[PDB]
Amino acid sequence: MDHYLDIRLRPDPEFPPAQLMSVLFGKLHQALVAQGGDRIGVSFPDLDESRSRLGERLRIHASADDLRALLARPWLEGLRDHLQFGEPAVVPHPTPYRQVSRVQAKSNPERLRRRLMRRHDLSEEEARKRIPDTVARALDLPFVTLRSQSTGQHFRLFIRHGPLQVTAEEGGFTCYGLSKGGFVPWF
Amino acid sequence: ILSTASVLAFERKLDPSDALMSAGAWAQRDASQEWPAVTVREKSVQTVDVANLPSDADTLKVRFTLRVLGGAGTPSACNDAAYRDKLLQTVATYVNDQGFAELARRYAHNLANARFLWRNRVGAEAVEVRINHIRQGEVARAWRFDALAIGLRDFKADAELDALAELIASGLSGSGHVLLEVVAFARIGDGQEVFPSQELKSKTLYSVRDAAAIHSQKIGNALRTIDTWYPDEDGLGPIAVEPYGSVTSQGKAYRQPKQKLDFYTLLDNWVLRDEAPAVEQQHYVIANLIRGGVFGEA
């Protein structure tokens, strides 16, 4: 993965950048599940860790031909007046690598209570004695707000950028463009 | 001395309607008069109002009507008759020097690209906007656009768009009755969430009679998003024509009164002391007069 393409969000009078970023993330997810493979990863070069913001850039890391496939596909149809596209160019070097992984938390105790009642045949009172309300963990992480298509639920997809590393390892990527082992260059 | 009048209440030209959104399937948009309406349904998470298409419907039909009135410089209330005559003379020299040909072209563009589809357009696969001129009831002239090939950012020439601009021009000049039925079909997907306007159980959605709807002033703000003559940095496109021309999403007020580019100082220079601005800023001033409002001091 030595090629990249910056999709920078234009400022828009009608939409905040996080809303357009989540819409672009869902469209990229649809393009990746239409594509297949595990070799296309994302990054967020304007990341602000202090306010947990993803910025206004989304950099798609892939090979050259995969980006040339994705730039012509209809996932960018309807988005081209909220985006500006660069070209698929080679990466600079030396660049440190980092991990772009999804971080999930047990943020609802009652879903865990329903799972415990399904897995141990207990009651609601045994569940509330077993799983109190101090288990609710709130993540201080940047996120995109996505709506699923198989189910109809709206969920927040928390993206955590890993610690910086000099040399990467081989690894694949999930269809959300995040890491299930893969690493991306960071610059 | 010809000071500014104490009251100036301009009526709203370009009256839109509440945009009723009904659902259905693509490739049968031509029989879309019996389409089922998008109903606002509750969901307990607190309880919130959500509005989705049915699971066999991928196309959101957002339909409204637009009355283009005319009489753009004449106020509905004005104290100083000398100021009223000077303002009508100023607007008349504007219209005779250069008619409603840039303003109406930009309003025709905001009808062409479905900017009135606010959030139902950002991930839409294909938007088609049908604009029907309705004179004496049936159809006078029918338009059909591809709202994605016509961009939100650029105002480019087209063959049908000049005819639509001439229609809105004749309506704004008083030279005819212009009533336009605007129907937009947004391919969103099967049962994807549509976004009607939002009233004020943490969230309520606007619904006229068991059918979701965008507010009329939201459609009017989308139609007025024509102002590209402001001091433009950062790559922000057209903004809505407002005095102290502001975007609440970005929190920034362009055309500040510290510069000489707000509507009020441009109007007080164009009318009182006859300092005619550039043609772009006077397009912006006449677009504010088409917007309406309460101008004048207290």
Swiss-Prot record, chain A:
Please give the annotated consequence of changing R102A. Loss of pre-crRNA cleavage, still binds crRNA
Q: Reported effect of changing Y176F? A: Cleaves pre-crRNA 13-fold slower
- Consequence the record notes for mutating H29A: No pre-crRNA cleavage, still binds crRNA. Does not support formation of the Csy ribonucleoprotein complex
Q: What happens when the gene is disrupted?
A: Infection with phage DMS3 inhibits biofilm formation; disrupting this gene restores biofilm formation despite DMS3 infection. Normal biofilm formation in the absence of phage infection. Loss of production of crRNA in the presence or absence of phage. Disruption of the entire Y.pestis-subtype CRISPR region disrupts crRNA production but does not alter phage resistance (possibly OLNs PA14_33350 to PA14_33310, plus the flanking CRISPR loci), indicating this CRISPR is not involved in phage resistance.
Q: What is the disulfide pattern of this chain?
A: none
CDD domains in alphabetical order? Cas6_I-F (cd09739)
User: Which residues are tagged with the site Substrate binding?
Assistant: S148
Other observations noted: In this bacteria, Y.pestis-subtype CRISPRs do not confer resistance to phage DMS3 or MP22, but instead are required for DMS3-dependent inhibition of biofilm formation and possibly motility.
Which family does this protein fall into? Belongs to the CRISPR-associated endoribonuclease Cas6 family. Cas6f/Csy4, subtype I-F/Ypest subfamily.
Protein name per Swiss-Prot or TrEMBL: CRISPR-associated endonuclease Cas6/Csy4
- Species name for this entry? Pseudomonas aeruginosa (strain UCBPP-PA14)
Q: Which gene encodes it?
A: cas6f
